[PDB]
Design a protein around this nucleic acid. Structure first.
Ligand SMILES: Nc1ncnc2c1ncn2[C@@H]1O[C@H](COP(=O)(O)OP(=O)(O)OP(=O)(O)O)[C@@H](O)[C@H]1O
Ligand SMILES: Nc1ncnc2c1ncn2[C@@H]1O[C@H](COP(=O)(O)O)[C@@H](O)[C@H]1O
Ligand SMILES: Nc1ncnc2c1ncn2[C@@H]1O[C@H](COP(=O)(O)O)[C@@H](O)[C@H]1O
Ligand SMILES: [Zn+2]
Ligand SMILES: [Zn+2]
Lengths: 378, 378
RNA sequence: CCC
């Protein structure tokens, strides 16, 4: 008696995700037997057929777990089912959840309904079986669909510090990018490359005016907040001063200058609120030597540099160990959910009840405040 | 020789229903091992306030099927999953459907996504194992949720002859009962007793002015139609003309006397259109020698006999042998789903693909049009 | 609010 396998389902987002983990030693990272992600945008490019997310998951979760089980050769083998319970569109959630319930009942095996974000949080620990980073740590999630700063004290205890009020970073970046006629799968990945290439070049006379909501450095309300929806409007009007119309016949020298400044400012804003948080509550961060930057936009170098430079020498004699997962794990996927559930199962010895329905809005601090949880055995 | 068991799921109504069937022999009727129904009420008024039916289904399917699998003694025994694909609310539907698919992937067994009404039509064939009634036959579906007349030429070939354009006879005999001073599970069944207990003792001088959906003249739907939502009103307008709440404090002789007439005038309307359709389309019925009347309200004895007598009018295109299934089969349940699945699997050698999604509104004629179906090896 |  040693080793268990885990079937993990993620459906909070646009992409249906299924994975299988062989948790062969409680001493070692699990091995990934199967990792399937069938996206809403992957049936569109070579598709021109636009589907609705809850229907996408409904249609793809069956064949996907079927494929996964075959690839993994593990149908008669799963021990735990983990599944994203919230937060998200409760249609898209019920897709995965009600299905995951099917597996569990059919197999007579435990189900864990997991916090989407706890996945993002806990993923950079899978690599080392939860030795790095050790709690407490802080984690900046920066995806197309979240932008949040989170102190994590224990597995059963997490506090959101700073959080967006409008859209997420990647969204607004992608949006700015698309207004400059980028089209790609990841619009802002493309726009970094663009800036990267011809640096000592771009019209240094172009100095557009972008904001960075520093009011929280004066009129402080109730919680601290990121905010990105202001950027695309600020771009448009700066265009509407100097050639919005020129959209097209600007040089492949200038367009690469609107880019770097749009990026710089929006990364300035994050750094601004990050600064304003650590400054104001040194007590909480006293005890933490590690900083995670997971999510999509983790993989930006300009950001990574700013983070390492403009923070990790401001908390006095407590540099930060920055850890950046592979964006192999940073995008939504069902692996994080699997890992997160191994951590719950092992460390709390909790599972979910079969009556758990989805949770539209699920504050991370309410992780175990909600019903569903029961102790496993002892 | 070999037999097989079926797990069948019905999640289209308000009630969460699951069944296991032993299809032990292809020359016998199958037996039921397990049949449960978690009615929406039992987790509302005795819990908190009124709960949405999709969350009901989501909350109850899993515990419910676990139990049924325990009772049936067959968690490892199921060879086929039958579940209601449509028609209804896609949130309700998809609770059971997404779940059902989970069972199917985990046990690696076929799924059949079943049409609710196919359920009701076929169920009388269950007991005789497909011999009685023989195709063609017509069926009259009179539940709290349907009032519909149907010709059935083959498993895969059903044609709706007349259908309600508003509420169903049940919903209508219920509100009428509610207004006469009744409550309960079957508000209208009760109304039957009140007049039954003392069939003679009723003020034979209380004649009431109820209508019969006044449209034998001014309407251009290509198709014949029932309607009931007038009767509640007619009754009210009438109870004005000769004493409001009098009902509540009238003799045994009067509460009944009007109830008999309301119950008459509704059945009258039903026999009326039933007659229209038998008259309009004579040779549609050429070889029909069987009339099934099923659904909640089919248990009523004035109906049963109005049917028997008033389409013995002049026995013409056919002389009908009536069949009235029990109420434990007529009211929504998962057994009829399971049976429909048997029929489909065995006769048509068909199953559903795991990509099947709900269908909100599913024409019975389109039973096999829609996507999903796939041949075993006919 | 809600499939
Ligand atoms: N006005 C409408 N426009 C588009 N779809 C509609 C409309 N009214 C009803 N629908 C139907 O309802 C569903 C779409 O709406 P719904 O909000 O339930 O889906 P969604 O946008 O993907 O949300 P969620 O993912 O949270 O369930 C589909 O099943 C669709 O057929
Ligand atoms: N180098 C990069 N610069 C800017 N955005 C990026 C980069 N790499 C990835 N992204 C963004 O990452 C997001 C992916 O979100 P998710 O799939 O949730 O990680 C997309 O919106 C991308 O535009
Ligand atoms: N003996 C009866 N006479 C008239 N209506 C009935 C009788 N029994 C049950 N019903 C009705 O059955 C309906 C519910 O539909 P069903 O889904 O078939 O149970 C309710 O409207 C009841 O009032
Ligand atoms: Zn995410
Ligand atoms: Zn029904």
């Amino acid at each position: 008696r040693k080793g268990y396998k885990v079937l993990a389902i993620e459906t909070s987002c646009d992409d249906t995700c299924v994975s299988v983990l062989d948790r062969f030693s409680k001493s070692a990272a699990p091995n990934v037997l199967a990792n399937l992600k069938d996206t809403l945008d992957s049936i569109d490019e070579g598709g021109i057929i636009p589907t609705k997310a809850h229907i996408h998951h409904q249609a793809r979760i069956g064949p996907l777990t079927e494929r996964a089980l075959i690839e993994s050769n593990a149908r008669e083998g799963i021990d735990l089912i983990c599944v994203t319970r919230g937060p998200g569109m409760p249609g898209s959630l019920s897709g995965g959840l009600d299905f995951a319930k099917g597996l569990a009942v059919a197999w007579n095996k435990p189900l864990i309904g997991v916090h989407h974000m706890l996945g993002h949080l806990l993923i950079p620990r899978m690599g080392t079986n939860g030795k790095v980073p050790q709690f407490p740590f802080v984690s900046l999630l920066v995806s197309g669909g979240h932008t949040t700063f989170v102190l994590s004290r224990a597995i059963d205890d997490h506090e959101i510090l700073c959080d967006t009020i409008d859209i997420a970073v990647g969204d607004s970046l992608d949006k700015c990018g698309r207004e400059l006629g980028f089209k790609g799968t990841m619009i802002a990945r493309e726009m970094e490359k663009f800036i990267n290439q011809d640096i000592n070049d771009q019209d240094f006379a172009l100095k557009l005016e972008m904001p960075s909501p520093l009011k929280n450095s004066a009129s402080k309300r109730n919680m601290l907040s990121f905010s990105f929806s202001a950027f695309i409007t600020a771009l448009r009007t700066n265009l509407t001063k100097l050639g919005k119309t020129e959209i097209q016949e600007l040089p492949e020298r200038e367009i690469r200058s609107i880019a770097y400044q749009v990026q710089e400012s929006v990364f300035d804003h994050i750094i601004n609120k990050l600064k304003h948080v650590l400054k104001s509550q040194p007590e909480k961060f006293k005890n933490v030597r590690e900083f995670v930057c997971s999510g999509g936009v983790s993989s930006n170098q300009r950001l990574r540099t700013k983070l390492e430079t403009e923070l990790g020498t401001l908390n006095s004699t407590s540099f930060f160990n920055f850890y950046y997962p592979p964006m192999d794990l940073c995008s939504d996927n069902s692996i994080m959910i699997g890992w997160a559930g191994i951590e719950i199962w092992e460390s709390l010895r909790l599972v979910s009840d079969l009556d758990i329905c989805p949770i539209r809005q699920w504050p991370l601090n309410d992780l175990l405040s909600v019903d569903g949880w029961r102790t496993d055995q002892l």
